[PDB]
Amino acid sequence: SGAIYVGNYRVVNRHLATHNDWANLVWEDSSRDLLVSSTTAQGCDTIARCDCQTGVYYCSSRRKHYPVSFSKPSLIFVEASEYYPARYQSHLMLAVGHSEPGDCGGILRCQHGVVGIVSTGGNGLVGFADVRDLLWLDEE
Numbered sequence: 001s002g003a004i005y006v007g008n009y010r011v012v013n014r015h016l017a018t019h020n021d022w023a024n025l026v027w028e029d030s031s032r033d034l035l036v037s038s039t040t041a042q043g044c045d046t047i048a049r050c051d052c053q054t055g056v057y058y059c060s061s062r063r064k065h066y067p068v069s070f071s072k073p074s075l076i077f078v079e080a081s082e083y084y085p086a087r088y089q090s091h092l093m094l095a096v097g098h099s100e101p102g103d104c105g106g107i108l109r110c111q112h113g114v115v116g117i118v119s120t121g122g123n124g125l126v127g128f129a130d131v132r133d134l135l136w137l138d139e140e
């Protein structure tokens with residue numbers, strides 16, 4: 001589990017979105033495993049605006065933050081998961097590291113702020129759904 005809280009927006013894995021998230025929907029994309037809902041209170045997180053390929057992610061299944069190198073966001077075949085079938089996921093960044101399904105929502109962060117959230121795992125890789133292209137998260 002986990003979310004990004006930026007202004008009056010809550011960014012979560014689409015597959016972990018609650019009824020309240022869907023009832024307060026701003027934007028969603030199945031291909032990116034992302035959903036954004038509205039919040040009453042303003043949020044503590046800042047979104048990176050950058051093309052960093054190094055950062056740190058939070059891994060709940062280890063209670064640890066790990067520094068990683070990661071690929072630029074791309075369209076990638078992902079094998080079947082407990083919450084999704086084998087499919088292509090877009091805006092996906094991969095790093096060598098530990099990921100289990102419940103790690104989804106862990107933040108990846110660079111010097112510029114929040115890069116993305118844990119979305120995929122298996123075969124020694126961790127995949128992150130990029131948010132840095134979502135410029136509209138910064139306003140309105």
Ligand SMILES: Cn1cc(N)c(C(=O)NC2CCC2)n1
Nearest residue numbers: 081099100101120121122123
């Ligand atoms: C976040 N996420 C989605 C997954 N499917 C996995 C995953 O397959 N985890 C295993 C543990 C050895 C890789 N992790």
Ligand SMILES: [Zn+2]
Nearest residue numbers: 050052110112
């Ligand atoms: Zn950065």
